[PDB]
Amino acid sequence: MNLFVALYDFVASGDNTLSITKGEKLRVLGYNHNGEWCEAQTKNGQGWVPSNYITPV
């Protein structure tokens, strides 16, 4: 399913970003212009996470 998995916990601040827990699986939708942030969908919602906090499964 070409999924990614969370390497570290990330908690959002504001409504653009998305909280993730280590081990969580994600559908990566895209990256921002410099690749620093990743738009993702998880079973919990949709939003941006740091690119360095996730990796392909």
From Swiss-Prot:
* Domain SH3 intervals: 2-57
Please describe the quaternary structure of this protein.
Interacts with SORBS1 following insulin stimulation. Found in a trimolecular complex containing CDK5 and CABLES1. Interacts with CABLES1 and PSTPIP1. Interacts with ZDHHC16, ITGB1 and HCK. Interacts with STX17; probably phosphorylates STX17. Interacts with INPPL1/SHIP2. Interacts with ABI1, ABI2, BCR, CRK, FGR, FYN, HCK, LYN, PSMA7 RAD9A, RAD51, RAD52, TP73 and WASF3.
- How this protein is processed and modified after translation, per its record? Phosphorylation at Tyr-8 by members of the SRC family of kinases disrupts SH3 domain-based autoinhibitory interactions and intermolecular associations, such as that with ABI1, and also enhances kinase activity. Polyubiquitinated. Polyubiquitination of ABL1 leads to degradation.
Q: Which family, according to UniProt?
A: Belongs to the protein kinase superfamily. Tyr protein kinase family. ABL subfamily.
Please report the name of this protein according to its UniProt entry.
Answer: Tyrosine-protein kinase ABL1
In terms of domain of life, where is this protein from? Eukaryota
Task: Give the protein's function.
Answer: Non-receptor tyrosine-protein kinase that plays a role in many key processes linked to cell growth and survival such as cytoskeleton remodeling in response to extracellular stimuli, cell motility and adhesion, receptor endocytosis, autophagy, DNA damage response and apoptosis. Coordinates actin remodeling through tyrosine phosphorylation of proteins controlling cytoskeleton dynamics like WASF3 (involved in branch formation); ANXA1 (involved in membrane anchoring); DBN1, DBNL, CTTN, RAPH1 and ENAH (involved in signaling); or MAPT and PXN (microtubule-binding proteins).
Q: Positions modified as Phosphotyrosine? A: Y8, Y53
The secretion signal range is: none
State the covered range within the intact protein.
Answer: 64 to 119 of 1130
In which tissues has expression of this protein been reported?
Widely expressed.
Query: Subcellular localization, per the record?
Result: Cytoplasm, Cytoskeleton; Nucleus; Mitochondrion
State the disease linkage annotated in the record. Answer: Leukemia, chronic myeloid: A clonal myeloproliferative disorder of a pluripotent stem cell with a specific cytogenetic abnormality, the Philadelphia chromosome (Ph), involving myeloid, erythroid, megakaryocytic, B-lymphoid, and sometimes T-lymphoid cells, but not marrow fibroblasts.
